[PDB]
Amino acid sequence: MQDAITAVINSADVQGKYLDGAAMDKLKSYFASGELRVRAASVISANAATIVKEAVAKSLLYSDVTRPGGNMYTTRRYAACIRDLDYYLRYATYAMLAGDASILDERVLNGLKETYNSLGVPISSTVQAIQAIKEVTASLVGADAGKEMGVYLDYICSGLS
Amino acid sequence: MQDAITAVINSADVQGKYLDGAAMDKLKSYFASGELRVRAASVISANAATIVKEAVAKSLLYSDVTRPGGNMYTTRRYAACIRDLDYYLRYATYAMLAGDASILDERVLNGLKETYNSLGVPISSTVQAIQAIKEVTASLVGADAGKEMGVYLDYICSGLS
Amino acid sequence: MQDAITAVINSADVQGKYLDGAAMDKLKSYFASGELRVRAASVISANAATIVKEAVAKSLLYSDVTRPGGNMYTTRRYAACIRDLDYYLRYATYAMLAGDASILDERVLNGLKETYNSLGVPISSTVQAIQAIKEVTASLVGADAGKEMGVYLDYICSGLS
Amino acid sequence: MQDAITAVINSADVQGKYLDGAAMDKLKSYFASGELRVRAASVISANAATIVKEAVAKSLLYSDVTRPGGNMYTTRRYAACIRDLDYYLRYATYAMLAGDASILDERVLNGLKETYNSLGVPISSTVQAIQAIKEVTASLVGADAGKEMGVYLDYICSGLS
Amino acid sequence: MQDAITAVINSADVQGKYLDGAAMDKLKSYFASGELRVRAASVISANAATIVKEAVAKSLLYSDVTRPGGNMYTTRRYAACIRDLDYYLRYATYAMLAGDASILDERVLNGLKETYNSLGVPISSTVQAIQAIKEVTASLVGADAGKEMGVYLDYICSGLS
Amino acid sequence: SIVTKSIVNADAEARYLSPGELDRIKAFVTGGAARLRIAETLTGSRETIVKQAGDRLFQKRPDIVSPGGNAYGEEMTATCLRDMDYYLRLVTYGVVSGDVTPIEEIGLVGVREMYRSLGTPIEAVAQSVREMKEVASGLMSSDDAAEASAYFDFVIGKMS
Amino acid sequence: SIVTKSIVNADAEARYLSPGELDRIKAFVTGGAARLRIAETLTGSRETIVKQAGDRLFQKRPDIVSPGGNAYGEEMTATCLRDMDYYLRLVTYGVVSGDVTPIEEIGLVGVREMYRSLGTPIEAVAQSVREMKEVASGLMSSDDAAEASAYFDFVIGKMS
Amino acid sequence: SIVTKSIVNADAEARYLSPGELDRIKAFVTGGAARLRIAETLTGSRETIVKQAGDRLFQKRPDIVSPGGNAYGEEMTATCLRDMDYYLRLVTYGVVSGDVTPIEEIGLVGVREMYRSLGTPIEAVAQSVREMKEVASGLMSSDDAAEASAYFDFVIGKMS
Amino acid sequence: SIVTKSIVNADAEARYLSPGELDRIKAFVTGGAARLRIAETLTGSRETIVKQAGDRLFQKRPDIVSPGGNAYGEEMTATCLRDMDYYLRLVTYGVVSGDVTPIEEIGLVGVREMYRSLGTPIEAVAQSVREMKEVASGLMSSDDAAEASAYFDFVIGKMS
Amino acid sequence: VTPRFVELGQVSAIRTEPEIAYRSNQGVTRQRQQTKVFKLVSTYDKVAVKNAIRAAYRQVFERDLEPYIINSEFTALESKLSNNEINVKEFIEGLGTSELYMKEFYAPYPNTKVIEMGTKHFLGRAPLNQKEIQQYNQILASQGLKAFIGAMVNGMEYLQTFGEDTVPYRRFPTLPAANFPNTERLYNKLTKQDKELVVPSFTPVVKVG
Ligand SMILES: *[C@@H](C)[C@H]1/C(=C/c2[nH]c(/C=C3N=C(/C=C4\NC(=O)C(CC)=C4C)C(C)=C\3CCC(=O)O)c(CCC(=O)O)c2C)NC(=O)[C@@H]1C
Ligand SMILES: *[C@@H](C)[C@H]1/C(=C/c2[nH]c(/C=C3N=C(/C=C4\NC(=O)C(CC)=C4C)C(C)=C\3CCC(=O)O)c(CCC(=O)O)c2C)NC(=O)[C@@H]1C
Ligand SMILES: *[C@@H](C)[C@H]1/C(=C/c2[nH]c(/C=C3N=C(/C=C4\NC(=O)C(CC)=C4C)C(C)=C\3CCC(=O)O)c(CCC(=O)O)c2C)NC(=O)[C@@H]1C
Ligand SMILES: *[C@@H](C)[C@H]1/C(=C/c2[nH]c(/C=C3N=C(/C=C4\NC(=O)C(CC)=C4C)C(C)=C\3CCC(=O)O)c(CCC(=O)O)c2C)NC(=O)[C@@H]1C
Ligand SMILES: *[C@H](C)[C@H]1/C(=C/c2[nH]c(/C=C3N=C(/C=C4\NC(=O)C(CC)=C4C)C(C)=C\3CCC(=O)O)c(CCC(=O)O)c2C)NC(=O)[C@@H]1C
Ligand SMILES: *[C@H](C)[C@H]1/C(=C/c2[nH]c(/C=C3N=C(/C=C4\NC(=O)C(CC)=C4C)C(C)=C\3CCC(=O)O)c(CCC(=O)O)c2C)NC(=O)[C@@H]1C
Ligand SMILES: *[C@H](C)[C@H]1/C(=C/c2[nH]c(/C=C3N=C(/C=C4\NC(=O)C(CC)=C4C)C(C)=C\3CCC(=O)O)c(CCC(=O)O)c2C)NC(=O)[C@@H]1C
Ligand SMILES: *[C@H](C)[C@H]1/C(=C/c2[nH]c(/C=C3N=C(/C=C4\NC(=O)C(CC)=C4C)C(C)=C\3CCC(=O)O)c(CCC(=O)O)c2C)NC(=O)[C@@H]1C
Ligand SMILES: *[C@H](C)[C@H]1/C(=C/c2[nH]c(/C=C3N=C(/C=C4\NC(=O)C(CC)=C4C)C(C)=C\3CCC(=O)O)c(CCC(=O)O)c2C)NC(=O)[C@@H]1C
């Protein structure tokens, strides 16, 4: 896992080259975005417990998934579902702080797709749930920070896609 | 794992409904099985090492398998095969008490064929030994309870082979 | 594992007979070769650290692996290469002293191919390094004594090939 | 296989939408690159035999592979490598002209790994020959055409690695 | 842990002096006694189980200890006592081989006395059993070896007493 | 199911079924007729039992339906009664199995996460299932009501 | 084998074989003529050695041949003779290899489990091995007798 | 980078970053401008800095470049300066990242083993890094000189 | 000692020493005479060996005795010669014990940290150990020199 | 003319984006360094104790045990650990010999898979060789589950690697052979990801007898 700064450093190290103008411009872009990312992180850790509530309420409540026979019935399944949403929210916030999708490749999306397939859980409904949490987080974190959160959430969906 | 009672409970839970007569009669059947299966389990646990003893004595014993070159050769491999027979007897009586063979698939047949192939264990000799323990247990517990013991042991053989 | 003495023992024990004249002669042949094997092993152990030096120098140094971004860049990775070459030399010495190429299969080649493939280690580059090991040791322990080390390093290469 | 022009089409059609501004801009970018792509493809086709000859001269010739016993020995095998390098160059040209490296993993990389493993082909030696071809073509087609050709050849090598 | 050689080395090193004539003489004495120590250790390892058998039978069986109300009552306590005696004999043999009683010091005595005090184990009965083991093992190893073996067993008794 | 964790406990110790567990299975199989009777009596009387339990729950603690409550919506009351039905089915399954395996393994593990996510107080549903126990004992035979109230006590205490 | 044992010990510490280990292998290979002669002698008198050992064992431990004993008929005495032959062969293998790892790997690890599954008194098996040791010592030189008796005593100790 | 360390600590603790971690990242971002200025100053004088560092190192340790030494030939001295360029590039990476993590990860783990394998005196490499630090500080502000000398001293200490 | 190592290995598996271990112990006690002869040879000429090795190392490494070096001054050089005597004594202990455990326990654990605290070039210590090695090998038999070479090389490698 | 050392350190070719992505993560994953090791240095800081307990839950069970419990059933163990009456090793062993652990990683798997999961959770890597698998098999068959985790945790390897105060964590062993790839396969798949055996049994190179 590497953030934007460490990603740039590793990319420069791959060619054995110093930080050229692109290196400094990307670094300054990340430094400018750091203020927004930190404030959005504070705001999202503010409501990480509550945000997933309306994220699932408008996504996976009173539907075929929650009822018996659905893959979200039974307290273990609902608890694992809310915990999965919490994991996605926390790790996407981690990526937003780091400003890189590297963490999601190995710590979230690595083995998640076939894990869900073996579990039999509906991947498409998870996709819509992550979209719903996308709008929910965009509502609280703002537009630009909302877009930064949404790009990572869409990356999670695409990996789970 | 799961028994016949839990099997019916899961089947009624998938529909998210109460137990009906169509499950009522099948629970009556298992309850009527009852003392027969539990007599059988007690008697099987009685001389637990015995059935393994004469079963190995009549099928694999005094044969090329126990001779040099055969996979039953050497004291370590002898103990390993005997321990495998104890596994098979214990899990078969487990299934008989529970009334479902899923525990075997959940505990016995999972990877047993592949692990034996990696170890180069003769599958045919093991299946014959399990048939031996089947007939020994049938002679030791009676016809009916011997019949459930035989069906579970034959399921073990079919999954293994 | 296995060696020449254990090789003869297993050959006699697979069919269960004692040691006949042929096994006796094979054991005497191994004992005759034991002097050369012990001398070569002692010489290689004395110069084991030195050999990998010029082996890497004439086969891996100043090449694409060593440049930045190469798999042998990142000095931790250089030390990993030195350690792996030392392991190869030590286990080849083990096989030479034992006289059987069985230790390599169950202690070196076991998962090494998949290890390097998962790690992205250049297999042909490692093969060339082991070949350089063979040439260097052949010029250090003599031709006849170096023949066995060449045989076992070649076994390692073929398993890794 | 997929190219830069149909890549946008599939990307837009997976969600079922039409071609928006982003897709239009991607198509215009590919059409702008088409000039250099066509020129590079024509120049490479004109000089394919000489390119593969020069790549073989500076990467494979006068080495262990070409010596007797080596995989380059047995002139049928040398012609097989000439044919393989011609295939790699031609399919890299196909991918460069297409703008997407999907033909590489669909008509070249599909099954190549176990092919070379079964044939005992030096994978790293072939990779080195591919970088030699990349360097030769980059010094003949220019900087940007060489850029794209090196990108696709390195994709082929990474598939090999 | 320390043996005669290490004991002499440490005794010389604490004063920071080289091995003098007395240390040389002690090392020579230990080397001379090494043959007898090895023979006694081999004999004891050949009949350790029988030694414990006979010592327990002559010193503990059919006494107030083995009867109900004694410490050795119940199969669990009997097995614990037998294991204790076996470990006593084995560690005494280790000390006899090493020529020093330190291994008894930090592998048999530290915590043993107050452990027996906490569990109420009779120290006097244990001492009598160890004396029985002493004479039984003397009867096997001859007077010369039995002197050293009983010296170490009496050291164990004195520490435990 | 008594037999399911009996066998699980035996397997965890790598031993056959002990005489005590065997005898417990003996008594369970011999007395399963009463358990099936209780299953039928709970299945048949579902509507009245849930109705009276919910009404007494509402009358004891109006805050569940008071302004700002999690059940102020007319639909929220029906959702709560659906929860009542779910727990009643769980109790029926447990009394059928002779053991509390299905209650915990259908509607108990992680219920606190359930209610923190949905905001429903745990004590409120505990009181609701207490009312269920009370009305069931009212409608049930005394000896049968003993075991039914025992399982209701289990669910209320463990979920409390 | 001594080479295998030393190699395993060195590999455990992740180091090349020490000079003492190399000296041990060199001495073993140099002296291998005596070990090969010992194995040849043991294999040569195998029939008489096993016959005398079993005969002396049977009057030494009549229970194994007594009614109710494990080996009552001539058929079971055949199994006793076969087991004693296996152990003599294992002793010869250890003698030639110079180390007890072949013996332990072939017929010592889990031997108690085998003789428990067969009902055989392991103590009497140890006694039979001891009788074979005595009869072998009667058919060898003092130093050769001691060299064979080392592995015989190892087998006896592990058995008992 | 402090960002990656904070993320790793949070993930290992399975929590969002605490307020203090957020302030630490905030101050890191604020000082990123000065850190980038320092990195640009170091990068702009790479060739010069390596020239004086190598010249002063060879003045202090003439044996390494003398005949028979590790760095005798012109190619060997070029390889010395290549290693020196590598280490200064790593120092620039660390200054950009604000922590010595990239320096340790790419060029400080197992460096002792590498230079022992190559026969290069590790103390001489540390002296070369010290010359690097001195010459770089000679052309930087005092505060920036100290900020870069922190990473330079970290590399020197790890080499020593 | 090899006896201590064998006892530790046996206690690790909770088994009596195998016949191979007893044979190795017997060989070690037989060779104890040669071990003691080598130890006496090393101890008799300890002062001359230490003095010659110190002079040779000073000739190779004048910096340590150069101004500003660790060993500058008569007392500092005397302390270094005392350290050389200490390591020669440790080598003698390893020779008599037949292994390297006493050397590792006394003067090879934490030696790097200790000398880094003292500001001593560890490479200079390794070179001094080497010089002591050649000095001892010159005045001692070929086989004795080879046997002591193992301990000297172990000390040198631990230094380096 | 460019300086010679620049050319020596200069990388050949252009090093396009695909090679950058491939070679940025080339060898062992950065998770070997991008992880935290929990040591209960002092018992006076209750927050640190709770963090260590949660880490132990996440390690042994691979997850936080929120959606898998009725209540906190390890409360007594947590109190004893926070009271400095037991070590972190004792807490880990108690978590191993708990009904929750048996329900999770013992009930739904064969004893070979049980050995795999136990070695992956407490020891931190995959089983070394066939002898270890055999030994754990006899332990499981003769004494059940509790003796298995007891033998693993109280072994010399656990004390030398994790000790009495360090929570177990995923390891990256070099030796023995195939231990590293087996451990990588064990830890590269999520909990309940799939059911086949990553290391069913080491195929013997030599068939003794
Ligand atoms: C002069 C008499 C003729 C001539 C020969 C020539 N050959 C090469 C180079 C190579 N020749 C071979 C041939 C073989 N390799 C094989 O494995 C087999 C038998 C199975 C054959 C026949 C190869 C592979 C090479 C190149 C690789 C290598 O040399 O190892 C050269 C040099 C070419 C160059 O540019 O280096 C020459 C001169 N050439 C003529 O014009 C004459 C007819
Ligand atoms: C007779 C057909 C079987 C038989 C029995 C047998 N036992 C012994 C000796 C002992 N048995 C015990 C066992 C216990 N003592 C206890 O207090 C309890 C706790 C519940 C048990 C289980 C003991 C301790 C002894 C030793 C003497 C003593 O009690 O202190 C013998 C004689 C052994 C001897 O050498 O004297 C015999 C014969 N043996 C068989 O072969 C039959 C199967
Ligand atoms: C009324 C006095 C009580 C109450 C009820 C209540 N429940 C919900 C919502 C839900 N309850 C569940 C319950 C379960 N799911 C299961 O799988 C199981 C059995 C295994 C149970 C018991 C679920 C899934 C939901 C959501 C969807 C649904 O309604 O079925 C609400 C709504 C609260 C909200 O904000 O959504 C209410 C009011 N609440 C209380 O306070 C009382 C204890
Ligand atoms: C003079 C400054 C010192 C010196 C240097 C020296 N180094 C080599 C050879 C190599 N140096 C390296 C170094 C690295 N590899 C990495 O990945 C990194 C971290 C980013 C570093 C610093 C390597 C890999 C080599 C060998 C491979 C190669 O050179 O490409 C030499 C030449 C060795 C030879 O035998 O050719 C020299 C001279 N040597 C000294 O004595 C000075 C202290
Ligand atoms: C919720 C949006 C959907 C849903 C969830 C659900 N998940 C599980 C089970 C698991 N979920 C995971 C996923 C992860 N665990 C991790 O540590 C991480 C790393 C970032 C992830 C992504 C795993 C591993 C499991 C299996 C183990 C477990 O029990 O948690 C379940 C239960 C599955 C079961 O059979 O019990 C459920 C219900 N279900 C839906 O229908 C939603 C769309
Ligand atoms: C006996 C019927 C046949 C036979 C068997 C044999 N098995 C082994 C080794 C193992 N057997 C198992 C099996 C299991 N482990 C489990 O957990 C389960 C379910 C609970 C099963 C079925 C395993 C894992 C091993 C390897 C580890 C061990 O020894 O415990 C051997 C020895 C293999 C070897 O040499 O390594 C043998 C010989 N042999 C026969 O001849 C019979 C036909
Ligand atoms: C037998 C000669 C006497 C006897 C034995 C006895 N011991 C125990 C319990 C323990 N004994 C020990 C001993 C040791 N631990 C060590 O590390 C060493 C060195 C190897 C020794 C000697 C320990 C630790 C225990 C407790 C733990 C355990 O038992 O495993 C008992 C059990 C007492 C009880 O009530 O449980 C007994 C009976 N008893 C006699 O009467 C003999 C004189
Ligand atoms: C004779 C003095 C003792 C005795 C012997 C006895 N053994 C058996 C049966 C078997 N014994 C073995 C032995 C071995 N298997 C191995 O792999 C090894 C070498 C590594 C040995 C020594 C075996 C294999 C069998 C089974 C038969 C077969 O060949 O497959 C019996 C028969 C028991 C029965 O009831 O059938 C007997 C009698 N019994 C005693 O009482 C003496 C102490
Ligand atoms: C060096 C010339 C080539 C090369 C090798 C390389 N390997 C690793 C890492 C590991 N190597 C192994 C191999 C083994 N472990 C064993 O037990 C055995 C038997 C003795 C073998 C062969 C393992 C397990 C690893 C991973 C664990 C570890 O690194 O300690 C690396 C470094 C990987 C990293 O991330 O640091 C390297 C560089 N790579 C090349 O490019 C050369 C051709």
Curated annotation (Swiss-Prot), chains A, B, C, D, E:
SUPFAM superfamilies named among the record's database cross-references: Globin-like (SSF46458)
Key words, A-Z: Antenna complex, Bile pigment, Chromophore, Electron transport, Membrane, Methylation, Photosynthesis, Phycobilisome, Thylakoid, Transport
Family annotation (Gene3D superfamilies): Phycocyanins (1.10.490.20)
Free-text description of this protein's post-translational modifications in UniProt: Contains one covalently linked phycocyanobilin chromophore.
Membrane topology reported for the UniProt record: Peripheral membrane protein
Protein's GO biological process: photosynthesis
GO annotations of cellular component type: phycobilisome; plasma membrane-derived thylakoid membrane
Residue numbers bearing the N4-methylasparagine modification: N71
Parts of the chain that traverse the membrane: none
Function: Light-harvesting photosynthetic bile pigment-protein from the phycobiliprotein complex. Allophycocyanin has a maximum absorption at approximately 650 nanometers.
Name of the protein in its database record: Allophycocyanin beta chain
Organism per entry: Synechocystis sp. (strain ATCC 27184 / PCC 6803 / Kazusa)
Pfam family of the protein (one): Phycobilisome
Similarity remark: Belongs to the phycobiliprotein family.
Curated annotation (Swiss-Prot), chains F, G, H, I:
Organism in which the protein naturally occurs: Synechocystis sp. (strain ATCC 27184 / PCC 6803 / Kazusa)
Modified residues (N4-methylasparagine): N70
Any single Pfam family the record assigns to this protein: Phycobilisome
Intracellular or extracellular location(s): Cellular thylakoid membrane
Function of the molecule: Light-harvesting photosynthetic bile pigment-protein from the phycobiliprotein complex. Allophycocyanin has a maximum absorption at approximately 650 nanometers.
Protein name: Allophycocyanin alpha chain
Annotated positions binding (2R,3E)-phycocyanobilin: C80
Signal peptide: none
This protein's UniProt keywords: Antenna complex, Bile pigment, Chromophore, Electron transport, Membrane, Methylation, Photosynthesis, Phycobilisome, Thylakoid, Transport
Superkingdom of origin organism: Bacteria
GO annotation (BP), single: photosynthesis
Family: Belongs to the phycobiliprotein family.
Cellular component GO terms held in the UniProt record: phycobilisome; plasma membrane-derived thylakoid membrane
Post-translational note: Contains one covalently linked phycocyanobilin chromophore.
Segments forming a coiled coil: none
Swiss-Prot record, chain J:
Subcellular location: Cellular thylakoid membrane
Post-translational modification comment from the UniProt entry: Contains one covalently linked bilin chromophore. This protein autochromophorylates.
Domain PBS-linker residue range list: 17-195
Transmembrane segments: none
Disulfide bonds: none
Function: This protein is postulated to act both as terminal energy acceptor (by its phycobilin-like domains) and as a linker polypeptide (by its repeats and arms) that stabilizes the phycobilisome core architecture. Has intrinsic bilin lyase activity.
Subunit structure: Heterodimer of ApcF (a variant beta-allophycocyanin). Phycobilisomes of this organism are composed of a two cylinder core, from which six rods radiate. The core is mainly composed of allophycocyanin alpha and beta chains and of minor components.
Family: Belongs to the phycobilisome linker protein family.
Name of the protein: Phycobiliprotein ApcE
Organism: Synechocystis sp. (strain ATCC 27184 / PCC 6803 / Kazusa)
